[PDB]
Structures are given as C-alpha cells and as structure tokens.
Amino acid sequence: IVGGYTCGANTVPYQVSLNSGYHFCGGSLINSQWVVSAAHCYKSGIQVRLGEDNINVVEGNEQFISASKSIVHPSYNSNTLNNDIMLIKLKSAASLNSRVASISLPTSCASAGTQCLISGWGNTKSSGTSYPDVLKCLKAPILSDSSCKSAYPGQITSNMFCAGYLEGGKDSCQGDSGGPVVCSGKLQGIVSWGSGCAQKNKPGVYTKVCNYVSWIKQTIASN
C-alpha cells in the first residue's frame, strides 16, 4: 500500500496473509472455513495466516491453517486477469474472535464515489521497493467506470472496477494482491492489477466481487 497508514493491530480482522514459506498474497475471510483471494495468487501448498499484524513476528493472536483445496474461477483468464478470484478452503475451521472475523459478501454492488478500505502488506513505495511488516490501510473511492476505461483502454471488463486517486500518490501495490477492498461493510473488491503503483492516471484495478456472490455461495455449499 503506497501512501496509506498503519492500520493498527487486528483492526482489519478479515485480512489474511497467504504464506508458502513467505507472505505472497492477501485474502479475505468470508466464514470460518473459506477465504477469498485473487486467482493470480493461485499456487499449491498454501497456509492461511489469520489474526496477523506484524507478519514477521509472532504477537499472540495468529492462527496458521493449511489450505485443503483451492478453486480458481472457472473463467479466469491469466492473460487479461478477467475473473481474477479464487476460493481457498481451510483444512480446519478458524476459531472466530474479535481479531479473526469474517467480512460480509455484498448483496449488491457499490456505486462510484463510495469510499472503501484497502489493506495489505505489499510494497509502500511508488518507485523502488520497501515492504512493511505491519498491515497498511488506505481509504480510497471507487472511480467512475469511464475514468477507469480511459486509463486502461480495451483492458477493463464488467468484472473489474478502479479505485483510488487519479492524481497518484495513494494506491495498492505488489504484495497486496488478493486482499480486500471493503465498502460499507461489504467485500466489494480484490486487489488485482494496475500500471505501476500510485502513478498519475493509473489507478488500481479490482475484481468486482458483487458479480461473483452467487458463484461463491454455490461453490462453498458444494465443497
């Protein structure tokens, strides 16, 4: 997260870290058994890390649980990142508590101009590289689809939306991949892609979760 702030420990209790010997993506807890992340975060051998603040220090509220299965959206296209969403099942249910909590799925989408919260452990510099070890937060509005498509012609689909600031300076970035965009208490986006990070007229692009709620609900009920 570029241009954001330190969230504070466990203030984003639905935020998970996916680990395969190291953090490599964010995700969101949607109930005690299931996490939502980006399809581009798919790999085998995932451990889900819940209750994290400093991801390099054991602070006392963590739960580390291996994934039993991963389910990439059946229409994910790795070339365009259309349908960039996947479901991860925990081999054992998480113990839910005030530091380890689920985020609600949308019943409807959110409108442009709605303020959201974006969070993660990704890069904090817009040029170069620095990784934080505590969770970072960013308040960011949903942008109009026309500003989104103008920035990225021919690349935006109806499964994507942009959020952030066209003047630059504040954005998500590498290593925030897969993590949440929460608006009005609902998971509306997943950190997916963008050109650089926090660059002028290059806002972030997020998977449009409200398009996937029926898929999510049917998939978890059958797996």
In terms of Cβ atoms closer than 10 Å to its own Cβ (0-12, 13-18, 19+), residue 101 is middle
Number of other CB atoms surrounding residue 208 within 10 Å: 23
Q: Is 171 within any annotated ligand binding site?
A: yes
Q: Is 76 in the site for ligand 50U (CB under 6 A)?
A: no
- For 156: left if phi > 0, alpha if psi spans -120 to 50, otherwise beta; the answer is beta
Which is the catalytic residue, given 17, 28, 40, 119?
40
Binding mask 182-211 for ligand 50U (x = CB under 6 A): ---------x-xx--x------x-------
176 binds ligand 50U (CB under 6 A): yes
Asked about 177 being catalytic, the answer comes back as: yes
Q: E strands of the chain, at which residues?
A: 5-6, 15-19, 23-31, 34-37, 47-50, 63-72, 86-90, 115-120, 136-141, 160-163, 180-183, 186-193, 204-208
The 131-170 site mask, x for binding ligand 50U (CB under 6 A), equals: ------------------------x---------------
Nearer to ligand 50U, 68 or 77 (CB): 77
User: What residues are labeled active site?
Assistant: 40, 84, 177
Binding-site annotation: residue ranges: 52, 54, 57, 62, 171-172, 174-175, 177
